[PDB]
Amino acid sequence: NFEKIENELKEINTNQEALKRNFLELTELKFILRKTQQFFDEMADPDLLRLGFVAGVINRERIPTFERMLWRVCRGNVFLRQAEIENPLEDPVTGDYVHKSVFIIFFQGDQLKNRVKKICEGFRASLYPCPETPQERKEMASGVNTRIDDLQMVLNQTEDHRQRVLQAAAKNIRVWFIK
Amino acid sequence: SDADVQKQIKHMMAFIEQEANEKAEEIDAKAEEEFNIEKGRLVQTQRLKIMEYY
Amino acid sequence: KQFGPLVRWLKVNFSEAFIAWIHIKALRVFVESVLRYGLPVNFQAMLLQPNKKSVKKLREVLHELYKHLDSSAAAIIDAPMDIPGLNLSQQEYYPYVYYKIDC
Amino acid sequence: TEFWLISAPGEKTCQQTWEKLHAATTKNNNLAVSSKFNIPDLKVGTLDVLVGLSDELAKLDAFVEGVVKKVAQYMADVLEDSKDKVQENLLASGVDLVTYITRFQWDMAKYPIKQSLKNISEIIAKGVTQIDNDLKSRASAYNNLKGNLQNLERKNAGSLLTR
Amino acid sequence: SQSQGIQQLLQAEKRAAEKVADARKRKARRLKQAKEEAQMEVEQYRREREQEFQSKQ
After folding, report:
1. A50/B15 touch (CB, cutoff 8 Å), yes or no
2. A-chain residues near D54 (CB < 8 A)
3. C-alpha separations of D1 from A174, B27, C51, D35 in Å
4. Which end of chain E, C or N, has fewer beta carbons within 10 A?
């Protein structure tokens, strides 16, 4: 009884962290996917390989230094854009709710790609994969919109299972301890 | 700022223009070279086959 | 026997070595000028020698002049240390392309 | 001595920048002597290629700084008995080093302007590395000869036991 | 306001991509023209040596 109780507790505890991380990642990806189309909101005439493109999210109070460092390392021609993501969102690894800005960078080739990705990783941002075309955007949007709800569902049900089993343990632990 | 935006965009359009120009001229030179050398190849081998025939 | 030939060889070779040095300086200047001021090419650089204790006022006035010739909206004020990654900044920055020769 | 190179970025026309940087500046005050660097109008590669050349010529400058002044160091060390007036013993050409630099221009005869900055920098780097190895060999040979003469001095030095 | 930058960048990318695509099409077309001209010159040599062979006979 003790072995099973503690083992199931350990397993759920461990799995909860991974599910939390993935759910938060997918939430941030969903937000970025949302704002990307607004960034394309000029004129939709087209029905739907030299410019490279990346996107991610940063914390506030970094934005000006980050922007100027990009502008200084890749002088005058790394096209960075950004916008606010209202309401905080937990950092999956840092574990802090903090104000966030979604950001994009466009570049011309491999040499600039290297610098951009390296400076991003140095500033410890979060990129996640991003699309290039409207149908890719819809694919990713649906893929994250199902998975976020799925992971939230399983997280909540498994936490309820934690509650049930932990109540069952606490109801009897003192007698278990004494025995 | 707006000045930065317009100047940066001007520079990027100029550089993509010149990148396209470079690729176009490079493919032009390669197409001409391969035009000449494909003439060489085909003409020479087929003419040598004709040499053997005659 | 050997001192004379060595001095002659070094005399001739320093000329070529330094000419190459300034060639690299010029190519550096051109690439950085294009990047800073994308095409078309419009960079006719200046060679400047500062006078006695002129540096302070000289660079103050140069910065004041170049405020708008190169955007003041970025950099200049401060910068962290970008060690992580392929490359990091080893040079000061200003509203202009600046390089130097240590003759 | 030290010399500065400043972009002078056009301003819609060369004169409206150069004349103001030179004549207007010097007439404002004599804080610096001014001249033109005579940049060559090289063929421009792709922006990605240019970003690669950014690092290439960032490192190359620091490399040649070492090599050329190593040539100068070994020059002085070989000519130690008369290294005075070092600037003339070094001078590439002209009467003075400043006289030389204030007249610099891209030299076609050594390397041509037509080729890409990649190839031109590679050939210049070949020249500089070969200069480095040539120093390491020939200056080392002269150094070994000088050390041999010092061994002779040791042979002629000290008590009669050591001599 | 913000979107026009991305719009212009994407449209310039499209223009450059179409230009280089047309250039590659040009490469292929000129290569096939070279092939055809090679065949025609082979045919000219074949005709001339056909005449020489008949004269020999």
Report:
1. no
2. 111
3. 85, 49, 11, 16
4. C
Q: Which of residues 17-56 of D touch C (CB under 8 A)?
A: 17-18, 21-22, 25, 28-37, 39-42, 44, 47, 50-51, 53-55
- Helix (H) / strand (E) element for A4: namely helix A2-40
Phi/psi at D126 (5° precision): -55, -50
Resolution of the entry in angstroms = 3.6
What size, in residues, is chain E?
Answer: 57
* A79 phi and psi angles, rounded to 5 deg: -85, 100
Nearest CA in chain E to A104: E6
Torsion over CA: A102, A106, A109, A114 (sign): negative
d(CA A147, CA A163): 24
Encoded tokens for D62 = 């620091």
Closest CA to A22 of A137, A108, A166, A150: A150
Task: Look up residue A136 and give its two tokens.
Answer: 């890719």
Is residue B43 within 8 A of residue E41, CB to CB? The reply is: yes
- Tell me the H-state helices in chain E: 3-56
Give the A-side interface with C, CB within 8 Å.
Answer: 65, 67-69, 71-73, 75-77, 114-115, 118-119, 121-122
The phi and psi torsions of A84 (rounded to 5 degrees) equal -80, 145
Helix (H) / strand (E) element for D78: namely helix D47-78
**Interface probe, candidates B42, B48, B51, chain E, greatest E C-beta count within 10 A:** B42
